[PDB]
Amino acid sequence: ETGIGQRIVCLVLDKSGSMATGNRLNRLNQAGQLFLLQTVELGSWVGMVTFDSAAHVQSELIQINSGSDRDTLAKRLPAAASGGTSICSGLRSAFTVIRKKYPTDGSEIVLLTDGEDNTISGCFNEVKQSGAIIHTVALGPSAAQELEELSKMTGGLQTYA
Ligand SMILES: [Ca+2]
Ligand SMILES: [Ca+2]
């Protein structure tokens, strides 16, 4: 959070090729739309990162004060799935997005992914150091175990699992 009590949240959204399977990308978009249009509270700072093998900042931190802010974030949810997978690239990019304004300690990441990534341990240290809270939504059934561990070690919530 900010020093004055505003939530800091970065959506980290898996748009990799595996997400083309089934309805995974539609479920990601549904979850992202619910979060952006209904759940996140007035006054929160909110950023958005997509990732395949590399991270793409869809939005720097912007504050939710109007329905236009929700809408402008929701219009940037990924339309298509392609490329490789690096959860860690997406999380590092989220940390950079947050740290343009604020510390990451007590900030939140909403990680929407199928979890099919066996290199997650590679950012454990950075994640522990960040103090961020990683919420994970597993959108497939073959999620690595390190996805859960991202949540467990940061105090985040786990869902679809
Ligand atoms: Ca607080
Ligand atoms: Ca993938």
Side-chain angles (χ1 to χ4, degrees):
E1 291 186 83
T2 71
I4 56 163
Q6 306 153 322
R7 182 178 209 183
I8 300 163
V9 193
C10 198
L11 272 48
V12 181
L13 304 177
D14 189 337
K15 58 142 306 272
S16 65
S18 53
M19 292 294 285
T21 304
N23 289 304
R24 298 174 183 192
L25 192 66
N26 276 330
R27 278 175 266 131
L28 177 149
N29 283 331
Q30 266 183 273
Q33 272 193 47
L34 193 77
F35 186 72
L36 292 175
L37 303 186
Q38 266 149 279
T39 310
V40 73
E41 62 268 51
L42 178 73
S44 300
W45 293 92
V46 174
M48 170 176 339
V49 169
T50 48
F51 68 90
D52 36 60
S53 58
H56 314 288
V57 183
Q58 301 303 320
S59 177
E60 306 277 22
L61 288 186
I62 68 139
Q63 205 179 19
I64 304 310
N65 292 296
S66 82
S68 303
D69 304 314
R70 307 181 179 275
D71 271 327
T72 177
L73 285 159
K75 284 167 177 164
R76 307 187 180 172
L77 295 169
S82 85
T85 302
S86 178
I87 287 178
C88 283
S89 311
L91 299 176
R92 279 158 201 154
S93 175
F95 296 162
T96 310
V97 160
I98 292 161
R99 288 167 179 150
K100 296 218 206 292
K101 286 260 269 160
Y102 300 116
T104 44
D105 207 330
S107 74
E108 296 169 79
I109 279 58
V110 179
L111 181 50
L112 304 183
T113 177
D114 60 28
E116 295 172 3
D117 182 355
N118 61 339
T119 83
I120 301 172
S121 56
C123 46
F124 276 178
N125 182 65
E126 295 158 275
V127 157
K128 280 171 288 199
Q129 236 78 253
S130 76
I133 299 147
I134 302 156
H135 311 293
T136 59
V137 191
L139 296 164
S142 318
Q145 170 70 15
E146 286 90 343
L147 185 63
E148 168 183 276
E149 290 304 308
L150 283 176
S151 290
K152 282 190 146 47
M153 68 202 275
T154 61
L157 306 185
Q158 316 156 214
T159 160
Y160 234 95

